[PDB]
Amino acid sequence: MISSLWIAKTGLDAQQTNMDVIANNLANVSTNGFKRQRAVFEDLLYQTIRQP
Amino acid sequence: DHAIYTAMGAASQTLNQQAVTASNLANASTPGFRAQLNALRAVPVDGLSLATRTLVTASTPGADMTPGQLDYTSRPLDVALQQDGWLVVQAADGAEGYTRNGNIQVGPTGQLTIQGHPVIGEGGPITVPEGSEITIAADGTISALNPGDPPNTVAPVGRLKLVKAEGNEVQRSDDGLFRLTAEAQAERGAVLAADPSIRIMSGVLEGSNVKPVEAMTDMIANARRFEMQMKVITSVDENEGRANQLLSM
Amino acid sequence: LLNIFDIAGSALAAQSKRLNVAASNLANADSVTGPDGQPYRAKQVVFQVDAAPGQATGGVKVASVIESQAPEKLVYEPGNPLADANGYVKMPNVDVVGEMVNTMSASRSYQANIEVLNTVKSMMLKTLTLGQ
Amino acid sequence: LLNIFDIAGSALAAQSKRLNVAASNLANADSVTGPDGQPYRAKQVVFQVDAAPGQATGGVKVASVIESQAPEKLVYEPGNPLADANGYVKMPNVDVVGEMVNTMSASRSYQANIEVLNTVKSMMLKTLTLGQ
């Protein structure tokens, strides 16, 4: 694994989790009292290599 | 012979630049994310005679300060900043980092926290009354109504400090939180004034500003550049090997 | 340094310097800036016939690496620093296909001179055994 | 051992060790953990000129294989052990292109030194028949 592969892996994972959240919301129409769930992501840490 | 290293440099740096775009690109749908633009620097190897070698180091001049795009979430305490504006947030180590992530949250103890390491405005970390029902105004004033009290009791409870600092005077700081470049500090000081001209639009979030077209073209160009370097590497290596026959006999 | 050895070794060095310049060009295409901050101007080598006194031929010298004075093709990015009035970045003038063929041709010339050296060296060693 | 044989044999051994380090790094990229539990720390060899007393030249020595303190790129898997607070595995910082090129360059240096050795062996054996 070079860094690009693993970073893109994480991006695809987050897209999959967002799609899961959307499908959970969207299947639960006609569910009494169900509150929609909004998935919020975040950047991981930045690793500096050469200071400006 | 050493030409191979120059080629390797480019190839290696190309992957690094790919890495940047990957992290730049995976963070679509991250609220407020400011895309990191990337560049390549020539590095001459100035020496005793016939300056021919230049290396190809990678670099990241900064973040693309094109404001992201808005999503009307109708949530009363989601905030979108105008162009060239920032929310101030206390960092984990303790300092005033800057963000454009407006997904403000209130904890059970009435503490305003964009994702933990909470927000700073007109004082310390802004704290609201426990029975929140929070609303945030156009210039930052935060007002609170306890849900079971007459709606003519909406007295303000805080002021969300806002900052104007754009582009070349702000740098990323190994978190999602920006800071000043340490050169825009023999300037507007280590802490900034509220700049009472930054507007706030509530009920709207802001997403990443990662242009997908520049990403796609960058990735195409990166792949081609890498494989051109690979051909140069093959040529240099096979030249050296098919040259080492000179020392025989 | 023996005379024909000098000729072919000069050829080897000149072809190697040409290939190194071509590699730098091919790697520094799409390089926004130099160290101080200026365009990366594509580089070329100048070949001259060596041995100024005598025979008017013999060997190649690659003195004076030069700067190809093409007009330095521009791009429009008026948010980047390094952009002038009417924001335009300087963006190296490197023609990648020409540089790829330059590398191929330099490698072929290198082959030719290497293998000329081998032939001549074998000839000299077999000359040493003249008579005995 | 002879003098020039020692020089070229030292070069051969040093290049072999450099290739070994390159192969170890190249095979241990994407290696989560070591025996005790620790990032695989990428390895490099330190080359020093040998023949410390006298003439300041001759041979190459590969003293003190060292370890690169480059920033040890992190990944996020907070279900794995080995992940600190803010779960971050350590995941070695081996540059694969760097090690491929190191392997090729080491092989070429190895060849040059082997073929030096063959030439010198021929020169000695032909020196024995000096005159007679």
Swiss-Prot record, chain A:
Compartments, as annotated in UniProt: Bacterial flagellum basal body
Domain of life (superkingdom): Bacteria
Family: Belongs to the flagella basal body rod proteins family.
Assembly and oligomerization: The basal body constitutes a major portion of the flagellar organelle and consists of four rings (L,P,S, and M) mounted on a central rod. The rod consists of about 26 subunits of FlgG in the distal portion, and FlgB, FlgC and FlgF are thought to build up the proximal portion of the rod with about 6 subunits each.
Name used for this protein in its record: Flagellar basal-body rod protein FlgG
Protein's gene: flgG
UniProtKB/Swiss-Prot annotation, chain B:
Example GO biological process: bacterial-type flagellum-dependent swarming motility
GO cellular component, one term: bacterial-type flagellum
Pfam families: Flg_bb_rod, Flg_bbr_C, LlgE_F_G_D1
PROSITE patterns: FLAGELLA_BB_ROD
Coiled coil stretches, renumbered: none
Localization of this protein: Bacterial flagellum basal body
InterPro entries: Flag_bb_rod_N, Flagellar_basal_body_rod_CS, Flagellar_FlgE/F/G, Flg_bb/hook_C_dom, FlgE/F/G-like, LlgE_F_G-like_D1
Subunit structure: The basal body constitutes a major portion of the flagellar organelle and consists of five rings (E,L,P,S, and M) mounted on a central rod. The rod consists of about 26 subunits of FlgG in the distal portion, and FlgB, FlgC and FlgF are thought to build up the proximal portion of the rod with about 6 subunits each.
Protein family: Belongs to the flagella basal body rod proteins family.
Protein name: Flagellar basal-body rod protein FlgF
From Swiss-Prot, chains C, D:
GO BP annotation list: bacterial-type flagellum-dependent swarming motility
Predominant location category: other
PROSITE patterns from the UniProt entry: FLAGELLA_BB_ROD
Similarity comment: family membership: Belongs to the flagella basal body rod proteins family.
Subunit structure: The basal body constitutes a major portion of the flagellar organelle and consists of four rings (L,P,S, and M) mounted on a central rod. The rod consists of about 26 subunits of FlgG in the distal portion, and FlgB, FlgC and FlgF are thought to build up the proximal portion of the rod with about 6 subunits each.
Keyword field contains Chloroplast: no
Keywords: Bacterial flagellum
GO (cellular component) term, any one: bacterial-type flagellum basal body, rod
Subcellular location as annotated: Bacterial flagellum basal body
Name of the protein described by the UniProt record: Flagellar basal-body rod protein FlgC
Keyword Ribonucleoprotein: no
Matching InterPro entries: Flag_bb_rod_N (IPR001444), Flagellar_basal_body_rod_CS (IPR019776), Flg_bb/hook_C_dom (IPR010930), FlgC (IPR006299)
Gene name of the record: flgC
Domain of life: Bacteria
Organism the protein comes from: Salmonella typhimurium (strain LT2 / SGSC1412 / ATCC 700720)
Pfam families assigned: Flg_bb_rod, Flg_bbr_C
